[PDB]
Amino acid sequence: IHHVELTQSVLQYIRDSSVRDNDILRDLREETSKLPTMQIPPEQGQLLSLLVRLIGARKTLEVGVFTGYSTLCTALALPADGRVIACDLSEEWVSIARRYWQRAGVADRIEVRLGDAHHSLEALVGSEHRGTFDLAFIDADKESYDFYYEHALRLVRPGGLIILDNTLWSGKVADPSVVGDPETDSLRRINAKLLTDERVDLSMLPIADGLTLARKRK
Amino acid sequence: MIHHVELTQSVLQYIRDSSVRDNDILRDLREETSKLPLRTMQIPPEQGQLLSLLVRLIGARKTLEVGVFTGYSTLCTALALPADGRVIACDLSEEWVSIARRYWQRAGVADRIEVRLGDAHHSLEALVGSEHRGTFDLAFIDADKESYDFYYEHALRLVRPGGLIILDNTLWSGKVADPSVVGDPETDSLRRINAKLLTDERVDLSMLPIADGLTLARKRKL
Ligand SMILES: Nc1ncnc2c1ncn2[C@@H]1O[C@H](CSCC[C@H](N)C(=O)O)[C@@H](O)[C@H]1O
Ligand SMILES: NCCc1ccc(O)c(O)c1
Numbered sequence: 001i002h003h004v005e006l007t008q009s010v011l012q013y014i015r016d017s018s019v020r021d022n023d024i025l026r027d028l029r030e031e032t033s034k035l036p037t038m039q040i041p042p043e044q045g046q047l048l049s050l051l052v053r054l055i056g057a058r059k060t061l062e063v064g065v066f067t068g069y070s071t072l073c074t075a076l077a078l079p080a081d082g083r084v085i086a087c088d089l090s091e092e093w094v095s096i097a098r099r100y101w102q103r104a105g106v107a108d109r110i111e112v113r114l115g116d117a118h119h120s121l122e123a124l125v126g127s128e129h130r131g132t133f134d135l136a137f138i139d140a141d142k143e144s145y146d147f148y149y150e151h152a153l154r155l156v157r158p159g160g161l162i163i164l165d166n167t168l169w170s171g172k173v174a175d176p177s178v179v180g181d182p183e184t185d186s187l188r189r190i191n192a193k194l195l196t197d198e199r200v201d202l203s204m205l206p207i208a209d210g211l212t213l214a215r216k217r218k
Numbered sequence: 219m220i221h222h223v224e225l226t227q228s229v230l231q232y233i234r235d236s237s238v239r240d241n242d243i244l245r246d247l248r249e250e251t252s253k254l255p256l257r258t259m260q261i262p263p264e265q266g267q268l269l270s271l272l273v274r275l276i277g278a279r280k281t282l283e284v285g286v287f288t289g290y291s292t293l294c295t296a297l298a299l300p301a302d303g304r305v306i307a308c309d310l311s312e313e314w315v316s317i318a319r320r321y322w323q324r325a326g327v328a329d330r331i332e333v334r335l336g337d338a339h340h341s342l343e344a345l346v347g348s349e350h351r352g353t354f355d356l357a358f359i360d361a362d363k364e365s366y367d368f369y370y371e372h373a374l375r376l377v378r379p380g381g382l383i384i385l386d387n388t389l390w391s392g393k394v395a396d397p398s399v400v401g402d403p404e405t406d407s408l409r410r411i412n413a414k415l416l417t418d419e420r421v422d423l424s425m426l427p428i429a430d431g432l433t434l435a436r437k438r439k440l
């Protein structure tokens with residue numbers, strides 16, 4: 001399998017010749033880097049902005065959130081009446097997320113469901129929000145990816161896009177020595193399941209920690 | 219340091235095995251292209267599949283292609299289009315496009331593909347001056363690398379606002395990043411278009427580290 005050698009020189013080049021950065025995004029990345037598999041690279045955040053604008057999304061779902069880099073890139077790409085429903089795992093990094101979203105003037109476009117993502121997603125599938133999302137970004141605990149995926153399939157509209165982060169898990173999914181690891185096994189299972197899942201169109205991208213695109217078929 | 223997943227043959231084989239939905243038609247075309255002097259110009263199956271996804275994602279009906287070869291990219295595009303969809307495909311070689319037409323017929327999509335045979339410069343000038351101006355949903359640029367700016371500027375007028383422009387080989391085997399590669403026309407042209415895209419406020423941009431570098435440029439609405 002022929003490929004481009006991802007030397008620091010080539011990765012620095014991709015960054016320098018494609019990343020449109022600003023002080024707000026840069027400052028958030030810097031702050032996040034000083035804290036305890038949730039560091040979104042700027043190339044990924046920019047792709048997220050592109051895909052949102054590409055499908056004419058006004059309503060999106062997020063599972064994970066953390067300091068809110070992926071959420072900020074999403075919201076910035078949305079129209080003035082757009083909304084991100086962000087299912088935030090914990091309140092620990094909420095006050096950081098809130099600061100940058102306010103600073104970038106997107107806080108009015110972001111709604112936080114604070115607490116257990118299984119519970120917010122269960123409420124959402126039984127709510128008026130069912131089948132109304134244009135895009136879903138799954139970036140939470142890896143053991144719950146199947147649950148998040150099945151819930152996202154009911155939450156997104158036909159033709160909607162589901163995005164699954166970390167599907168390569170540092171290459172561990174491909175590593176035969178990594179045996180019995182719950183996160184690796186769950187990601188291996190969802191990856192295998194997606195290949196033969198006729199409900200979606202599929203693309204697994206070798207960007208950041210592996211980024212899977214699953215378009216819900218009409 | 220920029221952290222990344224090591225692209226070992228094991229990891230690349232995994233991406234292929236766990237995501238590529240293949241068929242005999244696509245497989246046979248890749249096999250027939252591999253037995254030609256310029257086989258390395260073919261897009262890998264993961265790129266073809268992404269092309270199908272993006273076409274379906276934006277609800278595209280009408281697409282532009284510059285650089286057809288044996289037509290793998292064209293076939294993936296046409297297959298993703300609705301029954302009344304159209305690909306306007308530009309290519310210099312009749313020989314390579316005579317191979318392409320066999321697979322397009324076999325996959326029942328030959329009716330969806332229109333070939334402008336000859337120099338793409340003249341084909342795109344004719345298209346910009348015609349009824350086709352601003353009617354394309356997607357443009358795939360994958361021809362001679364020295365003409366990428368010309369192809370890009372023409373694609374910007376040919377695609378509708380919100381339309382997607384896709385530029386292949388923007389990493390050129392890493393040569394664009396290689397300081398020892400000096401005075402090479404293809405490398406210099408790709409370096410120039412890459413630098414130009416970064417500050418081009420007419421588009422939303424994403425440079426993907428897939429295949430030989432794949433640049434996505436969404437024409438903004440205004
Ligand atoms: N000036 C020009 N006008 C039209 N086609 C050109 C051109 N210069 C090069 N080409 C074409 O660009 C192609 C490059 S390879 C294209 C690869 C193809 N899309 C795939 O999926 O395999 C060749 O077929 C070559 O004929
Ligand atoms: N691989 C170097 C040769 C090459 C030339 C033109 C292409 O479009 C292409 O994908 C590859």
Ligand SMILES: [Cl-]
Pocket residue numbers: 438439440
């Ligand atoms: Cl816009």
Ligand SMILES: [Mg+2]
Pocket residue numbers: 037038039139165166
């Ligand atoms: Mg993540």
Ligand SMILES: [Mg+2]
Pocket residue numbers: 259260261360386387
């Ligand atoms: Mg190419």
